[PDB]
């Protein structure tokens, strides 16, 4: 039965805009990483919550990484068809609430199953579980995060599906504090319809009209990661002098 409408003119334009937005906002050569505060990796095979919190050795580097990435996500979001129709208030509510989620999704591009790390072109910029603990996070966030990255990789998304997924994440009508939920939902539906249509015309075999449900379940998983991150960030923020180690944008988004 399984009908396969072709992508409309407009849906094809939405995909090209999203791909363009992504390519303008994600440098796959990682060439800006030398501009961040440098990574420092203290000795911590233990690897000791007391010590991690005392030093927070990887925090200035990873806060700079995330802060830069939030800036990129803002730029990506402004190019999503319809985002600019939203009030400024709703734009910002959507950005602040999705930031960490979009970062976790876009990080999949540097994540490698070779060794279960985020590898950004060189061993100074390879991030492992241990480097995240050295920024003051705990295994209750990191291990589910890695499971998420693996499950995502194993979907083998086309770049089209990947950018649609990021856009769908940002334009979510159920975020706390949004005012025009209906408009946001309309924007999201246009994107969701484009993704469903895409998978059905363009993603082979296909028996896997399972993929759209799989993608949606990733969005649910990201919600869980987002709350756990928020809880841990709050604990991190109790560490004296933590704020120095962050950035103004990070502080505003998560504080
Ligand atoms: C951030 C990205 C990358 C990796 C992402 C990682 C690996 C390290 C640990 C990180 C940061 C997790 C912790 C829990 C966040 C903690 C945040 C605070 C401390 C504020 O609580 C969440 C995502 C994780 C590299 C890369 O894929 C992109 O990098 C720059 C853009 C790439 C290009 N071009 C992407 O945006």
From Swiss-Prot:
Transmembrane segments: none annotated. It comes from the Eukaryota. Residues 10-255 form the NR LBD domain. A motif (9aaTAD) lies at residues 248-255. Changing residue 192 to P: In VDDR2A; loss of calcitriol receptor activity; loss of affinity for calcitriol; decreased ligand-independent localization to the nucleus; loss of interaction with RXRA; loss of interaction with NCOR1; loss of interaction with NCOA1; loss of sequence-specific DNA-binding. Ubiquitinated by UBR5, leading to its degradation: UBR5 specifically recognizes and binds ligand-bound VDR when it is not associated with coactivators (NCOAs). In presence of NCOAs, the UBR5-degron is not accessible, preventing its ubiquitination and degradation. It is found in: Nucleus; Cytoplasm. Its main location: nucleus. GO terms for biological process: apoptotic process involved in mammary gland involution; calcium ion transport; cell differentiation; cell morphogenesis; decidualization; intestinal absorption; intracellular calcium ion homeostasis; intracellular receptor signaling pathway. Residues 78-96 are annotated as: Interaction with coactivator LXXLL motif. GO terms for cellular component: chromatin; cytosol; nucleoplasm; nucleus; receptor complex; RNA polymerase II transcription regulator complex. Calcitriol binds at residues 26, 69, 106, 110, 137, 229. Keywords: Cytoplasm, Disease variant, DNA-binding, Metal-binding, Nucleus, Receptor, Transcription, Transcription regulation, Ubl conjugation, Zinc, Zinc-finger. GO terms for molecular function: bile acid nuclear receptor activity; calcitriol binding; DNA binding; DNA-binding transcription factor activity, RNA polymerase II-specific; lithocholic acid binding; nuclear receptor activity; nuclear retinoid X receptor binding; nuclear steroid receptor activity. Belongs to the nuclear hormone receptor family. NR1 subfamily. It is linked to Rickets vitamin D-dependent 2A: A disorder of vitamin D metabolism resulting in severe rickets, hypocalcemia and secondary hyperparathyroidism. Most patients have total alopecia in addition to rickets. Composed of three domains: a modulating N-terminal domain, a DNA-binding domain and a C-terminal ligand-binding domain. Homodimer in the absence of bound vitamin D3. Heterodimer with RXRA after vitamin D3 binding. Interacts with MED1, NCOA1, NCOA2, NCOA3 and NCOA6 coactivators, leading to a strong increase of transcription of target genes. Interacts with the corepressor NCOR1. Interacts with SNW1. Interacts with IRX4, the interaction does not affect its transactivation activity. Interacts with CRY1. Interacts with CRY2 in a ligand-dependent manner. Nuclear receptor for calcitriol, the active form of vitamin D3 which mediates the action of this vitamin on cells. Enters the nucleus upon vitamin D3 binding where it forms heterodimers with the retinoid X receptor/RXR. The VDR-RXR heterodimers bind to specific response elements on DNA and activate the transcription of vitamin D3-responsive target genes. Plays a central role in calcium homeostasis. Also functions as a receptor for the secondary bile acid lithocholic acid (LCA) and its metabolites. This is Vitamin D3 receptor. It comes from Homo sapiens (Human). The chain holds residues 118 to 423 of 427 of the full protein.
């Amino acid at each position: 039965d399984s009908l396969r409408p072709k992508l409309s003119e407009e849906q094809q334009r939405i995909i090209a805009i999203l791909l363009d937005a992504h390519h303008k906002t994600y440098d796959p050569t990682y060439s800006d990483f030398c501009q961040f505060r440098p990574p420092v990796r203290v000795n911590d095979g233990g690897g000791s919550v007391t010590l991690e919190l005392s030093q927070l050795s990887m925090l200035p580097h990873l806060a700079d990484l995330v802060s830069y990435s939030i800036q990129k996500v803002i730029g990506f979001a402004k190019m999503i068809p319809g985002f600019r129709d939203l009030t400024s208030e709703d734009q910002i509510v959507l950005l602040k609430s999705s930031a960490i989620e979009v970062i976790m999704l876009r990080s999949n591009e540097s994540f490698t199953m070779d060794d279960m790390s985020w590898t950004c072109g060189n061993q100074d910029y390879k991030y492992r579980v241990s480097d995240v603990t050295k920024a003051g996070h705990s295994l209750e966030l990191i291990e589910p995060l890695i499971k998420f990255q693996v499950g995502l990789k194993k979907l083998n998304l086309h770049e089209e599906e990947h950018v649609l997924l990021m856009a769908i994440c940002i334009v979510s009508p159920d975020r706390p504090g949004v005012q025009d939920a209906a408009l946001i939902e309309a924007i999201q539906d246009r994107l969701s319809n484009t993704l469903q249509t895409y998978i059905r015309c363009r993603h082979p075999p296909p028996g896997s009209h399972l993929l759209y449900a799989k993608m949606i379940q990733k969005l649910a998983d990201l919600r869980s990661l987002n709350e756990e991150h928020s809880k841990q960030y709050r604990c991190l923020s109790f560490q004296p002098e933590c704020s120095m180690k962050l950035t103004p944008l990070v502080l505003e988004v998560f504080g």
